């Protein structure tokens, strides 16, 4: 089993607007010794399940404004924390975090919970990984909500999904510098910078998972994986492009955080074209990379969009 540590539960005692009860999956296949946290909100017997996938350097806390909206519509909501994040266990070595390590966790979670009629909800790494899941088990997936996200293919195949890595200087380049360089990385300060509408208490909730740097190996590895894509990642991601263009026939809703310096219009208009049936995006002028901080609007508008296309 992988060398991992667990955030003390007391770190979550004081949390702003996170009343969602914990659920855990221990020793998923491929993950012996590791406990994963997920939220499971709303009617457990609902036909529709909103699978809400977070990215870097967040956790299911990022979905706290969306979850109630989805639950109130009568749906079930599943919001897992990746290993390395949130209330999930945290491998201590960066080498144990890979694209497929995270991808296969999600596949194992879906199978363990037997999730069907899924509305996949993604942003950042939740999309880099989550957008590669439906082709593995297509009958489980019904709809997509895509916020600022793309596919980790090679630069020749989709230059838009690599150009952001090097320009602008104050985009991904700055993001990565902020995450991988400090010896004492403070995620509250990071999140106040990259999500400037957060309150102090909200920003503190993003620090809560990480008592010290030993808990942050998954946080450090994610931006390294955007800059350095292994062959498995490239191949899976390129296969997913074909899925979305040729195989997907589900209902789709896109929302763009227009202030994002990473995965804004430059990436999202190319993604819209690649996803068969994707409608014109909802542009959220004041939202940045962390579109879910404006997520009440995304959730409500997505539901309205799905109701009018049922
Ligand atoms: Cl923000
Ligand atoms: Cl990243």
From Swiss-Prot:
Domain AB hydrolase-1 stretches: 49-295
Known regulation of activity: Inhibited by thiol reagents such as p-chloromercuribenzoate and iodoacetamide.
Keywords per UniProt: Detoxification, Hydrolase
Pfam families: Abhydrolase_1
UniProt cross-references to SUPFAM superfamilies, sorted A to Z: alpha/beta-Hydrolases
List of catalytic residues: 124, 260, 289
Coiled coil regions, renumbered to chain: none
InterPro entries documented for this protein: AB_hydrolase_1 (IPR000073), AB_hydrolase_fold (IPR029058), Epox_hydrolase-like (IPR000639), Haloalkane_dehalogenase (IPR051340), Haloalkane_dehalogenase_1 (IPR023489)
Residues where chloride binds: 125, 175
EC number, as in UniProt: 3.8.1.5
GO biological process terms held by the UniProt record: 1,2-dichloroethane catabolic process; response to toxic substance
Pathway the protein takes part in: Xenobiotic degradation; 1,2-dichloroethane degradation; glycolate from 1,2-dichloroethane: step 1/4
pH dependence (record): Optimum pH is 8.2.
Thermal dependence: Optimum temperature is 37 degrees Celsius.
MF annotations from Gene Ontology: epoxide hydrolase activity; haloalkane dehalogenase activity
This protein's record includes keyword Hydrolase: yes
Catalytic activity, reaction form: 1-haloalkane + H2O = a halide anion + a primary alcohol + H(+); 1,2-dichloroethane + H2O = 2-chloroethanol + chloride + H(+)
Protein function: Catalyzes hydrolytic cleavage of carbon-halogen bonds in halogenated aliphatic compounds, leading to the formation of the corresponding primary alcohols, halide ions and protons. Has a broad substrate specificity, which includes terminally mono- and di- chlorinated and brominated alkanes (up to C4 only). The highest activity was found with 1,2-dichloroethane, 1,3-dichloropropane, and 1,2-dibromoethane.
Family, similarity comment: Belongs to the haloalkane dehalogenase family. Type 1 subfamily.
Subunit structure: Monomer.
Name of this protein: Haloalkane dehalogenase
Source species: Xanthobacter autotrophicus
Classification lineage: Bacteria, Pseudomonadati, Pseudomonadota, Alphaproteobacteria, Hyphomicrobiales
């Amino acid at each position: 089993m992988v060398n991992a540590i667990r955030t003390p539960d007391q770190r979550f005692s004081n949390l702003d607007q996170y009343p969602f009860s914990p659920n855990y999956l221990d020793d998923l296949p491929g993950y012996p010794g590791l406990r994963a946290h997920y939220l499971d909100e709303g009617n457990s017997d609902a036909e529709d399940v909103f699978l809400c996938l977070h990215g870097e350097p967040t956790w299911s806390y990022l979905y706290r404004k969306m979850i109630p909206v989805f639950a109130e519509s009568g749906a079930r909501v599943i919001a897992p924390d990746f290993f390395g994040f949130g209330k999930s266990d945290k491998p201590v070595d960066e080498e144990d975090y890979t694209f497929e390590f995270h991808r296969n966790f999600l596949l194992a979670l879906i199978e363990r919970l037997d999730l069907r009629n899924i509305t996949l909800v993604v942003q950042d790494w939740g999309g880099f990984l989550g957008l590669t899941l439906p082709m593995a088990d297509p009958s489980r997936f019904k709809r997509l909500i895509i916020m600022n996200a793309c596919l980790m293919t090679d630069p020749v195949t989709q230059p838009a999904f690599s150009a952001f890595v090097t320009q602008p200087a104050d985009g991904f380049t700055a993001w990565k510098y902020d995450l991988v360089t400090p010896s004492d990385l403070r995620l509250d300060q990071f999140m106040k910078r990259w999500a400037p509408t957060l309150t102090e208490a909200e920003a503190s909730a993003y620090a809560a998972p990480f008592p010290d740097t030993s808990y942050q190996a998954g946080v450090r590895k994610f931006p390294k994986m955007v800059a350095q894509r292994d062959q498995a990642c490239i191949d899976i991601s390129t296969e997913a492009i074909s899925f979305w263009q040729n195989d997907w026939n589900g209902q789709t809703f896109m929302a763009i955080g227009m202030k994002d310096k990473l995965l804004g219009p430059d990436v999202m208009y190319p993604m819209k074209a690649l996803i068969n049936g994707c409608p014109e995006p909802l542009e959220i002028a004041d939202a940045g990379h962390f579109v879910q901080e404006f997520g009440e609007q995304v959730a409500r508008e997505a539901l309205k969009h799905f109701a009018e296309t049922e």
